[PDB]
From Swiss-Prot:
Entry GO CC: cytoplasm; cytosol; extracellular exosome; extracellular region; extracellular space; ficolin-1-rich granule lumen; focal adhesion; membrane
Variant or mutagenesis effect after changing W120F: 75-fold decrease of sensitivity to CsA
Catalysed reactions, semicolon-separated: [protein]-peptidylproline (omega=180) = [protein]-peptidylproline (omega=0)
Residue(s) carrying N-acetylvaline: V1
PROSITE patterns on file: CSA_PPIASE_1, CSA_PPIASE_2
Effect of substituting K124Q: Acetylation-mimetic mutant; no effect on its interaction with TARDBP
Protein name: Peptidyl-prolyl cis-trans isomerase A
Assigned EC number: 5.2.1.8
Organism of this sequence: Homo sapiens
Amino acid sequence: VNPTVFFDIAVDGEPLGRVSFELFADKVPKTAENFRALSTGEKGFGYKGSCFHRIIPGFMCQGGDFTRHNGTGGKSIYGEKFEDENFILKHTGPGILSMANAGPNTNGSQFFICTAKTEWLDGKHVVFGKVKEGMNIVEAMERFGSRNGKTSKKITIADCGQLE
């Protein structure tokens, strides 16, 4: 209805588990569709096989750079960047899915999953989804991150697609 997408996560090739996300297409349609389409890979590029390049324990897990795998790339289905759609939703707690960016109106494909309430990001990053199942898998991923965001194991989206 509002779409659900999943990520199957692997840690150095070993299966960790599945996280699914509800995308708020009712409130942020353009942003939610970009993520949905990048998860199915239906426009010919997307998240399958990419990694979480920056994980900071107690704060958030960030990924979505499928072109340079380090936070300097990625692209949306609308072009290299697109505008901040609205800031209706807030970073209210663990499980919030929001867009990473490089300043106002620079949304591409990078996203982060909050593991804490991060109110200082409200009005700066567009919130568009939430973890539906597998929050415990995000908590497990979190243990491989560090204070500067570097991960001690390669965390990858082994598979991903739509469920609902």
